[PDB]
């Protein structure tokens, strides 16, 4: 006699032991998926089931947000420099309202 582990398949598994008829046993999920109205570490649930397709979402979100932030920073910097197209050392600030936009 002893103890034996068995990683049951998601869909189902067979159980043949002794001369008696076998039994079939399947598996489901029990991780804490749904939130409770407050911030929660939901990803862990989706990490326990389907380890694939659950980390790719985080990488995609990070890439999208990084690209958006970089594009916004570059565009605002260029638009500030072009709003400094009033190089215009002779005249005073064309409009100090824009100067507020610049800084």
């Amino acid at each position: 006699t002893t103890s034996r582990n068995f990683s049951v398949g998601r869909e189902g598994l067979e159980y043949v032991w002794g001369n008696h008829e076998p039994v079939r046993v399947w598996a489901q999920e029990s991780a804490p998926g749904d939130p409770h109205g407050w911030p929660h570490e939901i990803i862990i649930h989706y990490y326990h089931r389907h380890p694939v397709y659950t980390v790719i979402v985080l990488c995609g979100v990070a890439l999208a947000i990084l690209v958006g932030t970089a594009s916004s920073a570059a565009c605002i910097a260029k638009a500030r420099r072009d709003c400094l197209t009033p190089y215009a050392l002779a005249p005073n600030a064309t409009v100090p309202t824009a100067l507020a936009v610049l800084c």
Partner: protein, 438 residues
Amino acid sequence: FEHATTVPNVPGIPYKALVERAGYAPLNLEITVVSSELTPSTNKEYVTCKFHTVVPSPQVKCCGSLECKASSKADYTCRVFGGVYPFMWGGAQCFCDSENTQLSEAYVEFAPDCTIDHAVALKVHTAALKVGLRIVYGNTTARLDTFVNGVTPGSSRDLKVIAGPISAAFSPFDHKVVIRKGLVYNYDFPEYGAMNPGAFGDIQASSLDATDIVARTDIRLLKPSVKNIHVPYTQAVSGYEMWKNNSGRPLQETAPFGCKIEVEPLRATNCAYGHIPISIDIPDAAFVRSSESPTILEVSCTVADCIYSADFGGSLTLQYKANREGHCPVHSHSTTAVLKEATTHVTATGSITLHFSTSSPQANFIVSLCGKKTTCNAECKPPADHIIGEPHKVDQEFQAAVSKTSWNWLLALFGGASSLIVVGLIVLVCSSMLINTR
């Protein structure tokens, strides 16, 4: 009327559907695949079993000559030997000063036990599937059993019902197989007429009791080497016991989807895989006009509590207003959820509960009481117990495990940087013009 529907290949999984006809109350239709029967076409190739060598009385020519002669017996062997030394309890069988010679020969034949220890090599092809369907309509149960093909409707009440073909073809059987004592083994048996000593199917025969046999197992005669008359024979071990010792595990422990294999038809049964499209024809008389059907009014739903359970553990309730007594059906057009009972009584202002199951935790969907529809939403929780073999995933997941809260968070995550860049470019060009003014 004729209706088309697709059903999974699986036993004990009732599927419910409705038929829409103007002026006719929607008719509940329950379809159950009682079992599967995959029967292929096979041909008998030959038989094999433990053999027994033949050791007949040798021929002795005394003080003279003789010549070997072949024999039609399978795996026959013959050889002469001069200078024999014949002795026996009675003594020197015959007398001459070592001039005598003896011819020895041997062959093989299947032992009597083989009669019941026979193992047959089978060649199989063109797996064919037989499906038994039970259909309930209008609280009337009818049955049929049809080949999976989509061209041969079966006969039941003289009703033509067709099913299949399968979405995909599955067959645990391989081209070559063997059957022995009710056990089926997947193996590439040597072709008939090919004899290889120390291998499976060393002895081959068209039939168990065939007089004509062919075999080769490397029998070599040994020269007489002792006082008495004796025929020493050397041969390789029988291949039948060899294959028996290390035949491997049986197919019963290797068939995908747990096919239940039976030997007398050499066919599988109760094995689940794939989808099946089917068309069901129902007599018009079975339908009931909406005029006599109960009329319902101002119905509403309520999810008392639901659990994201693999088994059927979801509960629901409905409250209705009506004017006529009788029975109406109940259905759910959302595939993610499946009900348990198809019809129920109706009262003027009664309310009734329902048992159901779902494959997603977001229990939002549309369900119809009698003819009318109604939306109904709720959220379900995972269960404490997480291993069960009872029917599960009546509907397969459709990437709907994502929650409404998850959708709200994802929407709040993605930002509208495109609008920001567009506005930046617009103000940039405006400023560029303003400065081109100078």
